[PDB]
């Protein structure tokens, strides 16, 4: 069985980068819409007995991309692929992970069920919003971390990183920032709202680094940056693995006081970078390519949790 | 257990009509989008131990409506509804029912699987494109027919209906037109392409009635009407249960020679009727309401196959 | 269908209380061990067509209790009970909810799968460690909150509760304490370690109230109380819904500086209260009885989230 | 894919022997208990793409061992092992194979379901109490027989084996003893109770050999030996594949009249042999190692049914 | 929901008797064959929301009857029956319950799986060949016993029944005969082959009663009767719940020395009674009717295990 | 059948509270007067096959409220409600329960007869003036007690309640005060007139608690309080379930020496509390809601006699 890399419509640049780092060409697939807005998927090459990897991120027009992904998975499954893996850098509906005193659907579980019934045997994703989403599946799920690439960017871009601070925008981000701080050996502050917020950890004359999993409307990071500047921090950085940047996000970032908003390219950012000069992008295509290659060859994937390939 | 009728965003008028004919109010549900194009569903009333019916048609923005439908089904299922029924007047992806020498997904089967895994116990639909789609499910599926309402419209709108002709636009429509002709006791012609088409059945000075399940781009009915006028038919009618009317459909119908294009309101048509004066709408909300009420009360549903309620 | 309440061996007092508040007698079941440590379960009364509720908490000898619970569920399922509900006040293996950079099993998902395959149709539990565990099941799960009873105890036991403070022992407890503070209209502090910990929120001359979901070894609450007394708080309270109290817990609580350690009786505490004079117990059997009765009668269960029955 | 052998806590000696006969080292796994009696399993080596075999016998603290086994299976399954096999020399709850006019659970079926849902693809077991338990699974089950090793022991340990007798302790043991007698070409007696028992088959001055699948409380074999000595048999032997030896078993065997109680090491017997001088152990680790190796290499496993490796 | 009783083609007399004892008419169903030997099933009445019971015995042309049964179950399931129960007085392939050192299918498990996937929610059967077959299903299975009717026949037909003997034809029949003997308070003999057989239990001048679950080729009962007459028993009786009577059975019974071969009407016997004057039939339709009625009304079914209705 | 709660004009606040505690909306009913003072009742929703509860208290303009109640009962009865229950917290004409040497009507019996002939199937009332009024009906009557709520108020409002006294204003109130005293374990005094009255029971320096069923003109409680202060009691309390407060009542209470006059909200008191600062109100809407819910669900209602819901 050989690796076949297929791209959805959501993130073609990421898929091309991944295929480049594997020494492959993207699989021949036509993904369009009929006139009635129905997804049309045609696999243009035989995938019989192959190790198929479909790259599709939960971004853009989310329901359309998810439908395309499910249809591609099912097409490869009934075309007798030996194994079908969904490479989903940003997991759709990941924030619908709990009910919490509401008659709300756990939409992430529904997405996991639909991926399972489409025929996915393996999920590769990056920085799941909640790790418990791994339990929503009955198939193996590899949850990669952008932390190696984030630390690399911090070291090569913040000259004052030995005295800097790693700040979480909310309580739920504590573990990630603590890990980052430990690997950098730096002090780590915290922030949480009460319309007011409290920041704990000395930041005066010290660079603050907000680290968080995603920014959708950028209310969280903007409030955090406001408070960080209240406490007299010199410069403020925001680092995110998923730059959804929806709605008022670009205006808020433009009107905010960040020195940089760094995001990983799990979501295409070219358009967002057009209208916001302070957005920078970390390439994580090497981590995804390495994970695909290691799952194919049966090598350890947890090695990546601590090493940049 | 009491009937609860919930509406999706796709066809709110149809749901309101159905709820009216059942003497009920639509269930309290909020269906919106987050900023990142993610479906948000909130059931505003307890459905515990109730007989929930969700009305949503595979029209408009199809993937968005299907995602909303699945999310609503799952929300009602994990909110402890006794039974959840998906009322899907136009089944999405119904035309993806077969592979036919292509590495194509059978998307209708995938939709059936997703409806099953969301937790639907019953499907009510109208004029499935292929009856074999009933076999795609492991739950009961009630496939209603618009034929009663169609015959009623023909009798009350075509004064020459005793001498008229019932014509199929393609080979695959033969059974429906034969049934219509038998119930009307009229001659039935046929049409099939060869860029040329052949029409069999005397139509000169006789009204032709094209009857078909759906019109998406209206190429089929337009070519059929062209040939019918070649054979000297006096007036031409098109009757359809699903008026998708996507892409060039409205321009084609406006430039065509139909005396009327009649569709059933399984899909909202107000906007299409705005730009096409020859589209008429048959109400089928009574058939849907009667089917919902008969499934709830355990009465025979196959009774509707031959009787207008 | 009538309510049948069955008790496991884990918490017989709680089951008797629940049956009392429902006006019922506990179902006739023999639960013993064979000589080879194998669970023997014998339902002594017909459950055919009944609404069976099995009360068993993930406490004591956990694997034995879980096996007994699964065996009872399966026995009632193949004895033709109409519906089987597992009332699990403390969910076993709930802390194994994620992998987090380790080749660790998500044991909570395995427990959910085993409960599903034994034949449980409904789960009633109290204060799940992670709400995402609700997504581990495909059946409905009712996750009750001890917050109503906790607020009642605080108001009737802490005369200074209008000026008091609600403190979380770790970051992951933020939401619960914020809800408690909002319903009491009090200031809410926070605590997190760095061997050192930082406390945010004025507590001098003010009573601190640690609120947390469980205490297993009581390291978390003991460190939190140490820091709270460092910041000069007058008296310190710990409130918990699950008092596992395993290992060095009783000695730590005896050597600690709590004014009271209050727990809810989701786990039997008679033995622990024998060796620790500062443990108090909140009865939550009324919430469980009300939830059982409301699920049986089809009434709203989410009503309990805000009201003491 | 390479063989990985993992040991549970139940029978570490058997697992070490099996790994020795395969030329392997036991896989690196930590299996302990948290303070609250919860099973903790940590796979210390990557099993990605490997052929994992977990050795765990339904002995000792049975529910704890079964939970450990299920947790290990699930851990290896979601760690992307190519195939997971449960090597279960003594199947837990095997005697709960039928209902038989009681509202009793078929606990063996529940255990099979839990093994399936944990993710086991293959079961290797020895001398199932009922062969129909193979039908409880939907995965392949290899049910090895200790008969080759038993015949070897009889021939090398009973000098009078050509004139001896093979006796069943109950009716349900008839097939096994008949097979043993046929392979030895000896007369076979039978025993069954009526507090009295009847023995059929001449045994005077002839050695009797009780052969049975398991001895739990040793009431069956002790009553059989009593009757055999009533009929004037010279010496009495008991041979068993599973020596559970629970409760009053050791005292009964010490007070009985056996010349030897021979058991196979599907269960650890060191402790039991400490307090009973007449217990002897047949090694069956070679049969288990050969079965593991033959399933891995795709060679015939049914070959072992008649040949000692 | 009301009881609907449907008959297959296998045993129409039994179904009519059952419907009579329930005060019902048999449901309107057409069960025929197309020209190509394909089963055609048409439910002639609505079963929507009803409690459907399909009576079909594993007799006659077994594969044809089983296919008809599965097709009827599926037809009633997708016709929206509330609950479908398969009343299978003689379970097909019940003797294929184990592998036993052969690459043989466990066909009984396959039949259980097919019944489950057709949509059966409940199985009612009589005297399963192995009780472990109840574990082959994941749905409830009621395994009725003919013992009440057998004891009634013995008491009303064998005037010497207080001094008689209850004999098992093989080892595997021990439990049934022991139960019969206990309820009659009589001595119980046993028989097993070695071409020779041994009988244990005094039978001289005493009537022997062979009791067994089924007679297929009647080799077992004929050899048992031969040995019983060797031991000087006065008269010999054979009692069976399933009279398959295939192949040389009728000639063997005619040439044998039975005073009577009594069978229960789980299989039609009119044709067999035509060519064998010593076959008598016990009606068990009352037990089946009582079980159907008690499962419908939610009353105890295990009551029948000891009482003739 | 579902619960329908309808409010009369007498006590709309109580009905809204009851509907809130049942999770319902008040039924749509228009209750007005024509110009000629005639009651107009229009049920605005179908009550066919429903469980109708009409809440109306014998207060305010009593004859008008009673006529409205009877008209509503009759309207729901001839609108085919399955069952109609009159929830009458204060029973009108309850004090006309006997003749007693006068040509007086037993008006309470007449009211019971009119309620029966209007079509009421069930009466729920609170603290009937005479229990024998239950015998005036031939339908079931549930006579709830305010004693649980009264004891709760006493314990949470009179800090000296362990040494207090429970005093009856007249002889006819003996049973109620004795029950209250027994549940509180306190001494109970008594009072009865001779223009003079005698008080029995030590009250010096002890709080006296007058407990009585109703206060109409408050002559009884005012004379009792006068005597209690004659005997040197420190503070005096009056507790009543029905605060009619007609005529000179408010002036008498204002000029009296009560520390508090506590009443239950069986009658609206907002207007009376406007002109009397010492009137406090106990909510009993939870008892009424619980009784309605328990009668609907068939649960025990006599449970409430001893427990606050
Ligand atoms: O839309 P934005 O203002 O950019 O906010 C996005 C936030 O949503 C998620 O947090 P969530 O609110 O789910 O809290 P949690 O991380 O504690 O679950 C995530 O951690 C981001 O902080
Ligand atoms: O987009 P339009 O030009 O309006 O055509 C829509 C056609 O699609 C379907 O037919 P299909 O081509 O699937 O053939 P079939 O009915 O024989 O399957 C349907 O019967 C319509 O005739
Ligand atoms: O054994 P103890 O010292 O009593 O600690 C028990 C802790 O375990 C859980 O927290 P966890 O460590 O899982 O963190 P989380 O709540 O943030 O997930 C729980 O919230 C308790 O605080
Ligand atoms: O606890 P002990 O006295 O050692 O008895 C253990 C017995 O249990 C099993 O027989 P079972 O009673 O299940 O009968 P069966 O073999 O006929 O099913 C097994 O065959 C042993 O003989
Ligand atoms: O075809 P016949 O000669 O009439 O034999 C039929 C026999 O088959 C079954 O026994 P089986 O051989 O399966 O043994 P068991 O009952 O011990 O399983 C059954 O108990 C009958 O005795
Ligand atoms: O109008 P008021 O001065 O407030 O009096 C109202 C009194 O009427 C009732 O007593 P009743 O006189 O009927 O005597 P009884 O309770 O002994 O029947 C009731 O018990 C009150 O005590
Ligand atoms: Mg969140
Ligand atoms: Mg967050
Ligand atoms: Mg087609
Ligand atoms: Mg067509
Ligand atoms: Mg945790
Ligand atoms: Mg915590
Ligand atoms: Mg047995
Ligand atoms: Mg045995
Ligand atoms: Mg057999
Ligand atoms: Mg047999
Ligand atoms: Mg009076
Ligand atoms: Mg009075």
Swiss-Prot record, chains A, B, C, D, E, F:
Residues 204-219 are annotated as: Binding of phosphoribosylpyrophosphate. Changing residue 141 to L: Found in a patient with an intermediate phenotype between ARTS and PRPS1 superactivity; likely pathogenic; normal PRPP synthetase activity in fibroblasts; loss of activity in erythrocytes. GO terms for molecular function: ATP binding; identical protein binding; kinase activity; magnesium ion binding; protein homodimerization activity; ribose phosphate diphosphokinase activity. Pfam families: Pribosyl_synth (PF14572), Pribosyltran_N (PF13793). Activated by magnesium and inorganic phosphate. Inhibited by ADP and GDP. GO terms for cellular component: cytoplasm; cytosol; ribose phosphate diphosphokinase complex. It is an enzyme of class 2 (transferase). Keywords: ATP-binding, Charcot-Marie-Tooth disease, Deafness, Disease variant, Gout, Intellectual disability, Kinase, Magnesium, Metal-binding, Neurodegeneration, Neuropathy, Non-syndromic deafness, Nucleotide biosynthesis, Nucleotide-binding, Retinitis pigmentosa, Transferase. InterPro entries: PRib_PP_synth_CS, Pribosyltran_N, PRibTrfase_dom, PRTase-like, Rib-P_diPkinase, Rib-P_diPkinase_bac. Its EC number is 2.7.6.1. Mg(2+) binds at residues 127, 129, 138, 142. Its cofactor is Mg(2+). Disulfide bonds: none annotated. CDD domains: PRTases_typeI (cd06223). Pathway: Metabolic intermediate biosynthesis; 5-phospho-alpha-D-ribose 1-diphosphate biosynthesis; 5-phospho-alpha-D-ribose 1-diphosphate from D-ribose 5-phosphate (route I): step 1/1. One of its GO terms (biological process) is ribonucleoside monophosphate biosynthetic process. Changing residue 143 to H: No effect on catalytic activity. It is linked to Phosphoribosyl pyrophosphate synthetase I deficiency is a rare condition caused by mutations in PRPS1 that lead to variable disease phenotypes including optic atrophy, retinitis pigmentosa, ataxia, peripheral neuropathy and hearing loss. Catalyzes the synthesis of phosphoribosylpyrophosphate (PRPP) that is essential for nucleotide synthesis. Belongs to the ribose-phosphate pyrophosphokinase family. HAMAP family: RibP_PPkinase_B. This is Ribose-phosphate pyrophosphokinase 1. It comes from Homo sapiens. The gene is PRPS1.
């Amino acid at each position: 069985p050989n690796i076949k890399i297929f791209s959805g419509s959501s993130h073609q640049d990421l898929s091309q980068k991944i295929a480049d780092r594997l020494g492959l060409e993207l699989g021949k697939v036509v993904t369009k819409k009929f006139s009635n807005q129905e997804t049309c998927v045609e696999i243009g090459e035989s995938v019989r007995g192959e190790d198929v990897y479909i790259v599709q991120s939960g971004c853009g027009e989310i329901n359309d991309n998810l439908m395309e992904l499910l249809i591609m998975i099912n097409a490869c499954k009934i075309a007798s692929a030996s194994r079908v893996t969904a490479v989903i850098p940003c997991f759709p509906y990941a924030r619908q992970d709990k009910k919490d005193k509401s008659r709300a659907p756990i939409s992430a579980k529904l997405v996991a069920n639909m991926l399972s019934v489409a025929g996915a045997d393996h999920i590769i994703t990056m920085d799941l919003h909640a790790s418990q989403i791994q339990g929503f599946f009955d198939i193996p799920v590899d949850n990669l971390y952008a932390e190696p690439a984030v630390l690399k960017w911090i070291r090569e871009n913040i000259s004052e990183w030995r005295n800097c601070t790693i700040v979480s925008p909310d309580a739920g981000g504590a573990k990630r920032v603590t890990s980052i701080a430990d690997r950098l050996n730096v002090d780590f502050a915290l922030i949480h709202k009460e319309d007011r917020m409290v920041l704990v950890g000395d930041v005066k004359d010290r660079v603050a680094i907000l680290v968080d999993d995603m920014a959708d409307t950028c209310g969280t990071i903007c409030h955090a940056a406001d408070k960080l500047l209240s406490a007299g921090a010199t410069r403020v950085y925001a680092i995110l693995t998923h730059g959804i940047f929806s709605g008022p996000a670009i205006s808020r970032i433009n009107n905010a006081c960040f020195e940089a908003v760094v995001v990983t390219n799990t979501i295409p950012q070219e358009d967002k970078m057009k209208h916001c000069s302070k957005i920078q992008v970390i390439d994580i295509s090497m981590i995804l390519a390495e994970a695909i290659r290691r799952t194919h060859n049966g090598e350890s994937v947890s090695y990546l949790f601590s090493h940049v390939p």
